[PDB]
Design a protein around this ligand. Sequence first.
Ligand code: SF4
Ligand code: SF4
Ligand code: SF4
Ligand code: SF4
Lengths: 327, 326
Amino acid sequence: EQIKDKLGRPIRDLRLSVTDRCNFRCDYCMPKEVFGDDFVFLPKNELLTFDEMARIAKVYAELGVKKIRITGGEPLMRRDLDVLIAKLNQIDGIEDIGLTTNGLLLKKHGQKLYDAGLRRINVSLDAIDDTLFQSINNRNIKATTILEQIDYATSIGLNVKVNVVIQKGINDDQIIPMLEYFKDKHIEIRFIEFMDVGNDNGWDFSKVVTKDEMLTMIEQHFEIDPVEPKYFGEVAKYYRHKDNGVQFGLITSVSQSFCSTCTRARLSSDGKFYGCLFATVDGFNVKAFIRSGVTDEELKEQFKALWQIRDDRYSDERTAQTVANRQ
Amino acid sequence: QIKDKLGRPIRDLRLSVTDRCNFRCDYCMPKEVFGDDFVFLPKNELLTFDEMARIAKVYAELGVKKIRITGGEPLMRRDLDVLIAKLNQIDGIEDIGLTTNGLLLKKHGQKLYDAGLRRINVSLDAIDDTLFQSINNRNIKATTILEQIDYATSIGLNVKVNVVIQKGINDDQIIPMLEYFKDKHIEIRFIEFMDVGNDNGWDFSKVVTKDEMLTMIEQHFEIDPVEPKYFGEVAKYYRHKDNGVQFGLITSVSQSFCSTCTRARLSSDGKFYGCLFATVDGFNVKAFIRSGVTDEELKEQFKALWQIRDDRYSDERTAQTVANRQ
Ligand code: SF4
Ligand code: SF4
Ligand code: SF4
Ligand code: SF4
C-alpha cells in the first residue's frame, strides 16, 4: 500500500500526459524549428485510451497515489477530455485531480470539464504584455485572450492558479504587472525559476532570476509577509500581500532543488513510465505491457517494481555538478 | 576532481583533534556517560600532528580546500599552534577554521593567531548566565565566554557564533543574542535542532524551524534577505536594515542539504567518516598509515573511500518524514 523508491520517497502523484499536440509552439518546449510543418505526432491509436488511463490510475491509487495532474501537450486539445475526468472522479483514493493548460480553450471546454468533476486548474502564462506573449507562444495568441479565459473559468466555479516561468532578459519585467493584475483578481500566481543546463553540465544561471533576486524586485513594489509551509515537503515558498491577503509563490527549481521530497510518477503521451520530468531515454512501455493482456495484479506489481527502482534526482545532480564546476 | 556516488566532490576536511572537553553538556557529553570514571583516548592513540599534516596534503590533492578543526574542545589539545602552523603551509588548503566553546581563547588564542588561525566559530547555546550553566554543567558563565569572544576579536580573529536551538530550552535566547551580537558587529547563526523520532522521521516537537524563527525576529527587528554569497551557500543570511550586521539561519531539518555536502571527516581516534551521522566504525586511517604506506597509496585509499560514499542522512530523514505523513 505504501511503496518507497531507492531514495526513500513514497509515490503520491501521477502525471498523465493526454496528448503530444499543442496549440502553441513556445521556444523552450516545442520550438517551431523541431515541431514545424514536417513533424509527425502520435497516431491516435498510439495514445493510451481513457479506459487504460483510468485502470492505471486505479492501480496506482492502491499503491498510495492520491493526486493526478492532467497535462499534454495542451490537454484541452484531446477530444472528450471530460470523459477522462469522469472516470478518474470514480476512483477510490484519488482525492485531487488537477489540470494544466495554457487556457486558450477554456471557454470551449471548461463547463464539460467542470460537469465531470474538474475543480482546479493551473494556467501557464509567461507574460501579460500582448506583444511579448506572442513572441513567446509563436502562434499569434494574445495574453488578453488568456486573461479572458481565466475569468471565464473562475466565473463557472473552477479554482485557478497561474504559473509563470521567468527567463532573465525575456520576461523579467512581467513579474510586477502580473503580481498586480492577479492581486486584484484574488488569484494565486507562482513564479518559477528557469531550468537550463549549460555545457558543463551544471546549472546555467546566465538567465535565471533566482527566488532571491525575484524577491528583491517584489519587495520594492509590494509589502509582504512570508507564509509558513502548510505541510512538510511543500515546494513553493509562499508570501502574502498585507491588504487583502492574497498569496503568491516562488519556485526555487534551480537555486534550491527538491528531489528529496519528490513523489511524482509520470506516464508520457505515448504510454511510457518516467520517474522524473527529465529523461533522455525511453521508459518502460506501460502501453505495450497492458495491451498484451494483463491482470490488475500484474500491472500493480509492475508499477510497484518500477517505483522501487526509481532513483531519479536530475536537479540535485545538476546542483552537485554546478558545485563541482568550481574546480 | 574525484566524486562520490551522488556526484559530490571533496572540498572540506573536518579534523577532530581530541575526544576531551572542558564542558559537560547534557545533550553531548553528560556527566552520566563521561563522568570522572571515563578513560579518554590515550595520547598515543590520537593522530599525531604529522599524520594530520600528511593527511591534509593528500586530501588537498584530491580537491580539499578547507579544514575545520574540532574535537570535543580543540583547545585542550596540547600544542594546537604547531598543527595550525603545519596545515597553513600546505598548497592549497586555502582556509583553516576552528570551532571551540571558547573558554580557553584568552589562554591559547594568540599562539593560534600567530600560527595562522584567522577564523573561528564559537558555540554558545545561551547568553543568560543561569541557563547556560545548566547546559555546560561546569559552572561556566555565559559572560565568561562573551569576554573570550571579545579578546579573540581584539587580537584579529574573525569570530562567528553558533547557537543550536531546542524548543523547550533555548527559544528565548534568540532575541537577546541577536541584540547583543548586532551591537558587537558579530555574525551569529541559529541552527535547527536535529532529532529523529520512533517512526525514523524528523521530530518537530523540539524544533523551532527557520520559518518560525523568522516570525519571532521580524517582530523584534527590521530585516532584509541577503542573496546567497555563492550557489549552494548553506546558511540563509539576513541583515539589520540600520547598521548592516548579518545573521544566519541554518535549516538542518526543514531543508536537508545533503546534495551539496562535500565534507570528509576524521575522528579523534583516527577513523574516516563520510557523514556526521554514522553507526558503523569507519575505515581506520591511523592503523593504515601506521603500517608501511606511501603518499600515493594513502591518496589511492582516500580516493577509494570517497568514490564509494553515498551518505545522505538528513535527506533520508526528510523523505521518511514525508512517507510518515502518511
Ligand atoms: S503551451 Fe505548454 S505544452 Fe504547448 S509549447 Fe508552450 S509550454 Fe509547451
Ligand atoms: S528533477 Fe525529477 S526527481 Fe527532482 S524534483 Fe524534479 S521531477 Fe522530481
Ligand atoms: S562543549 Fe561541545 S564537545 Fe564539549 S560537551 Fe559541550 S557540546 Fe559537547
Ligand atoms: S547528513 Fe551527512 S551527507 Fe547530509 S549534509 Fe549532513 S553530514 Fe552531509
